[PDB]
């Protein structure tokens, strides 16, 4: 019966990613005074099917200079991690109930970065190597700030259990309590998923396609699928962390609906930010994370450590 649960948690996210791309293309078109995919089926609803079939019936390429083992392993690792990240999240009840769920998400987030590095290196291409090094720099930029923000936010929760975040926000969203950390966390999620204005790893205008320039057909489809799944996962994590929906024990449908709506709103905001802003420089991105986000994040961490003690508001569940 658990295998059915795994399948029902795997297939819908793949469909949602396929659909998310269509929505993303359509939103960008309407923000740019155009339509987006409409001919392929009614309102472009069959565009994801066409893209999937076309990519999976196209011939994949094995470069002569490439190390084949890593070249094949990297997309597998990326997609597997993107699918594995979904289980810890509770909507309302998590598929796998971890005592330390947030630590699990952080560990897998670190693991996901390695796949990007490996694909670029195994390509034996100059642009791929540049993209891999850019991903290394991006991780160096965002990792510590993300972790400290997460710790400071969870200090009001009393544990690293993700389900407890539903009980902590029973009466008020955490956005009303830690909105500076919320903005920093949104920027950190934008940088984590290699999304504009931080899509430096792919770098379309600078590095052709970036790390996956040598990738084609099925492996590229899996990379793209993985990238979108990470986007949705991170937005879901943000909605769980900062906008706590009300959970009724006798009707989980209400919490599921609210969680889905908030995740979709955050994803649409991601597409909006992509549509509205230029691209950074990765040295400029690191300088922003270190010279601007890091000092204020340290100060916010000190403040959020102090506040429960001096306010007598220490959360339970030691």
Partner 1 sequence: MWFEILPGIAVMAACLFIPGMATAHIHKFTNGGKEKRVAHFSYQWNLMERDRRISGVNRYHVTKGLENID
Partner 2 sequence: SRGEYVVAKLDDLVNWARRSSLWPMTFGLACCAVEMMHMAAPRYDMDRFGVVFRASPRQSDVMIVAGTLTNKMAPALRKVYDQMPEPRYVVSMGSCANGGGYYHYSYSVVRGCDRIVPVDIYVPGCPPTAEALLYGILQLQRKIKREKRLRIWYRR
Partner 3 sequence: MTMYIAFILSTIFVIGFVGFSSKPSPIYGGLGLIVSGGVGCGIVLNFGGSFLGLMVFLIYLGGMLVVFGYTTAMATEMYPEVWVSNKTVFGAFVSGLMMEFCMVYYALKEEEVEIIFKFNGLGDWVIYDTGDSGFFSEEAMGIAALYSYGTWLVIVTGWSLLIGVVVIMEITRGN
For ligand CDL, give the closer residue by CB, 27 or 72: 72
Q: Distance (Å, rounded) from C-alpha 224 to C-alpha 277?
A: 22
How many residues of this chain interact with partner 1, rule: CB under 8 A? Answer: 47
Q: Out of 5, 8, 32, 110, point to the residue binding partner 3 (CB under 8 A).
A: 110
67 binds, among partner 1, ligand PLX, ligand CDL, none (CB under 5 to 8 A by kind): ligand CDL
Give the residue from 164, 46, 31, 11 showing the smallest Cα distance to 97: 164
- Residue from 57, 65, 99, 313 touching partner 1 (CB under 8 A): that is 99
Q: Which is nearer to ligand CDL, 73 or 307 (CB)?
A: 73
Q: What is the DSSP string of 73-95?
A: HHHHHHHHHHHHTTTTSBSSSBS
The H-or-E segment that residue 97 falls in is: none
Q: Name which position in 51, 80, 268, 315 contacts partner 2 (CB under 8 A).
A: 51
Please report how close the Cβ of residue 21 comes to ligand CDL at its closest, in angstroms: 27
Q: How far is the CB of 130 from ligand PEE (least distance, A)?
A: 25
* Smaller CB separation from partner 3, 109 or 238: 109
Should residue 180 be labelled a site residue for partner 2 when binding is judged by CB under 8 A? Answer: no
Element (H, E) at 64: none
259 binds partner 1 (CB under 8 A): yes
Q: Taking each helix axis as running N to C, give the angle between helix 2-31 and helix 218-242, from 0 to 180 degrees, rounded to the nearest 10.
A: 90
Site for ligand CDL in 58-77 (CB under 6 A): 67-69, 72-73, 77
DSSP track, 13-53: HHHHHHHHHHHHHHHHHHHTTS--S-SSSGGGTTHHHHHHH
What Cα–Cα distance (Å) separates residue 57 from each residue in 47, 63, 212, 221? 15, 19, 19, 11
77, 118 contact by CB (below 8 A): yes
Which residue, 110 or 246, is less far from ligand CDL as judged by CB? 110
**Measured from the CB atom, is 80 or 269 closer to ligand PEE?**
80
104 binds partner 3 (CB under 8 A): yes
Residues 164-183 that bind ligand CDL (CB under 6 A): none
Query: Under the phi-then-psi rule, with left for phi > 0, alpha for psi from -120 to 50, and beta for the rest, what region is 222?
Result: alpha
Tokens, residue 193: 């998923």
The residue ranges that bind partner 1 (CB under 8 A) are 1-2, 4-5, 8-9, 12-13, 15-16, 19-20, 22-23, 26-27, 30, 35-36, 38, 42-45, 86, 91-95, 97, 99, 161, 163, 232, 249, 252-253, 255-257, 259-261, 263-264, 268
């Amino acid at each position: 019966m658990f295998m059915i649960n795994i399948l029902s948690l795997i297939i819908p996210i793949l469909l949602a990613v396929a659909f998310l791309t269509l929505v993303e293309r359509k939103v960008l078109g309407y923000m740019q005074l155009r339509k987006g995919p409409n001919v392929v089926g009614p309102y472009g609803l069959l565009q994801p099917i066409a893209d999937a079939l076309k990519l999976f019936t196209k011939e994949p390429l094995r470069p002569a200079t490439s190390s084949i083992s890593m070249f094949i392993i990297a997309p597998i690792l990326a997609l597997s991690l993107a699918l594995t990240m979904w289980v810890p999240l509770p909507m309302p009840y998590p598929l796998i109930n971890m005592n330390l769920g947030v630590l699990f998400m952080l560990a897998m987030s670190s693991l996901a970065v390695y796949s990007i590095l490996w694909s670029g290196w195994a390509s034996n291409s100059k642009y791929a190597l540049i993209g891999a090094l850019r991903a290394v720099a991006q991780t160096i930029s965002y990792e510590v700030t993300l972790a400290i923000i997460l710790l400071s936010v969870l200090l009001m929760n009393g544990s690293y259990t993700l389900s407890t975040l539903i009980t902590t926000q029973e009466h008020i969203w955490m956005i009303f309590t830690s909105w500076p950390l919320a903005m920093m966390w949104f920027i950190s999620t934008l940088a984590e998923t290699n999304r504009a204005p931080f899509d430096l790893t792919e770098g379309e205008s600078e590095l052709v396609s970036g790390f996956n320039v040598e990738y084609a057909a099925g492996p590229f489809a899996m990379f793209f699928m993985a990238e979108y799944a990470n986007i949705i996962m991170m937005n879901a994590f943000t909605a769980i962390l900062f906008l706590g929906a009300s959970h009724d024990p006798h009707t989980p449908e209400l919490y599921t609906i609210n969680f889905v709506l908030k995740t979709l709103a955050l994803t649409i905001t991601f597409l909006w930010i992509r549509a509205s802003y230029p691209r950074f420089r990765y040295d400029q991105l690191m300088h922003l994370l270190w010279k601007s986000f890091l000092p204020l994040t340290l100060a916010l961490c000190m403040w959020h450590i102090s506040l429960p003690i001096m306010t007598a508001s220490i959360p339970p569940q030691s």
